[PDB]
């Protein structure tokens, strides 16, 4: 196709005539806006002082199962077999 000055392969063969030069990089996408937009800060000055959030406190640690007593009520109830002990611990 690029026979003479008709289509594009590289900058050398362009030969921009008349009004302007053809696009090169990738782009004229017709109305894409170039540059980093602005006017964005998130938190507002009025919002600054009024709220003043706090620590909110963390979460304590979760204690594990107590086992020594686990034998206590188990013996109190009246179960002594290994299989039964499997039954009581779940409850």
């Amino acid at each position: 196709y690029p026979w003479n000055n008709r289509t594009q392969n590289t900058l050398l063969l362009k030969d921009d005539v008349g009004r302007s030069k053809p696009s090169a990089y990738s782009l004229p996408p017709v109305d894409y806006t170039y540059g980093r937009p602005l006017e964005r800060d998130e938190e507002g000055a009025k919002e600054v002082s009024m709220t003043w959030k706090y620590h909110a406190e963390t979460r304590p640690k979760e204690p594990d199962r107590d086992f020594a007593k686990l034998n206590k009520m188990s013996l109190t109830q009246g179960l002594h077999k290994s299989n039964q002990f499997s039954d009581y611990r779940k409850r």
Binding site: D16, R19, A24, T33, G35, R36, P37
Partner: protein
């Protein structure tokens, strides 16, 4: 309720104008057909409601040479302007100013004056005036002097804005342009509060250095000019963070009643190609605004200190972006201010992006800025032009035509002191105390 009328005179004045409305017409919405598209009332400054339907922009075109007028009325812009507003002459001045200031213009300014009052009646907040014309033309200047002279007496305290394009120091289109150049300087100095340089030589470079337009034409230059005009009218048709009124324009750019010439600069201006790999940060963009090559006037800012610069900002620009970048402007040592000016910065902010004519070379960008200021280096152009005069007059070459056209011999002599007197004014102003 704030509006200003537009007056067009001369070939280039009309040609530049055409781009003026094309850009404006697109922005506020009114299509070429004129019917409002399928309220805000922000366009009251440029247009006037006809009661129902389309709108009639406040325009009056004038030119003694019929070709310019004929072209507009056969194009796609026939349904916009009122047909009675196109006052056109019969015989062109043929660049013979005296033809246009003594013998021909006088028979046409009246109708120029007459429609002036009528348009004046409709308005309610008439703020100022605009003049579009050049100095290197016979017909344009002669009428150009008359409108401002006549308008000046009719109204007076009403403001005046000056946009004329002086001839380039090295390139030209006519041969006797310098005579027209100074002469228009003879009378304009007594009626204008502002004066702006638009030497076409500098405009081209912006097309090559950045626009990368290898073979630019007049059309390209006009499109940019309309951008500067529109650049100035944003603070008159929309809400801005810090508004500035036409009253605060000669407010800051005119230290003395006489010195009223300014040079304009706009930036950034990139095609689609280059801008893709840019940030367009306010720090750099304002950094570019003062670049010795971006100014629209082929003058050396480095040959003189600065006096006072007023710059307008538009887009999503944030206030903290300007001043911080503003202070760094002082830090640079290559630019030295006049002693008696502790500060020479005027700031403008608004929330409207820049508009690009479809199919043109300009490309959208969120932020843009325009620069207008008065500097002591302007004198060179008058310095260079004035000396060229003595070459013309040394043997009175071409004197045989202007004198017999109605202009007395002494007329050239008097302007010399006016131009000569103006030179000393600049030289005296810059001296430190």
């Amino acid at each position: 309720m704030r509006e200003v009328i537009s007056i067009h005179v001369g070939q280039g004045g009309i040609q530049v104008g055409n781009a003026c409305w094309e850009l404006f017409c697109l922005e506020h919405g009114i299509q070429p057909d004129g019917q409002m598209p399928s309220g805000d009332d922000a366009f009251n400054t440029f247009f006037s409601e006809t009661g129902a339907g389309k709108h009639v922009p406040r325009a009056v075109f004038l030119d003694l040479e019929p070709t310019v007028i004929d072209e507009v009325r056969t194009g796609t812009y026939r349904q916009l302007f009122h047909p009675e507003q196109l006052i056109s002459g019969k015989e062109d001045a043929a660049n013979n100013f005296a033809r246009g200031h003594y013998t021909i213009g006088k028979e046409i300014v009246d109708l120029c004056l007459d429609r002036i009052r009528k348009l004046a009646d409709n308005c309610t907040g008439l703020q100022g005036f605009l003049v579009f014309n050049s100095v290197g033309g016979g017909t344009g200047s002669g009428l150009g002097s008359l409108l401002l002279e006549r308008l000046s007496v009719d109204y007076g305290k009403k403001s005046k804005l000056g946009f004329t394009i002086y001839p380039s120091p090295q390139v030209s289109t006519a041969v006797v342009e310098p005579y027209n150049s100074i002469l228009s300087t003879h009378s304009l100095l007594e009626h204008t509060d502002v004066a702006v340089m638009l030497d076409n030589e500098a405009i081209y470079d912006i097309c090559r250095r950045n626009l990368d337009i290898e073979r630019p034409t007049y059309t390209n230059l006009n499109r940019l000019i309309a951008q500067v005009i529109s650049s100035l009218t944003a603070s008159l048709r929309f809400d801005g963070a810090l508004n500035v009124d036409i009253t605060e324009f000669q407010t800051n750019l005119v230290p003395y009643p006489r010195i009223h010439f300014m040079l304009s600069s706009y930036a950034p201006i990139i095609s689609a190609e280059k801008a893709y790999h840019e940030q367009l940060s306010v720090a750099e963009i304002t950094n570019s605004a003062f670049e010795p090559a971006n100014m629209m006037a082929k003058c050396d800012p480095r040959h003189g200190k600065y006096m006072a610069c007023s710059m307008m900002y538009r887009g999503d620009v944030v206030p903290k972006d300007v001043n911080a970048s503003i202070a760094t402007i002082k830090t640079k040592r290559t630019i030295q201010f006049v002693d008696w000016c502790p500060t020479g910065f005027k700031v403008g902010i608004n929330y409207q992006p820049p508009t690009v004519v479809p199919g043109g070379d300009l490309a959208k960008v969120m932020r843009a800025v325009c620069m207008i200021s008065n500097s002591t280096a302007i004198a060179e152009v008058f310095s260079r032009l004035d000396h060229k005069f003595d070459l013309m007059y040394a043997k009175r070459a071409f004197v045989h035509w202007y004198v017999g056209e109605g202009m007395e011999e002494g007329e050239f002599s008097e302007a010399r002191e006016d131009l000569a007197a103006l030179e000393k004014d600049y030289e005296e102003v810059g001296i430190e105390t």
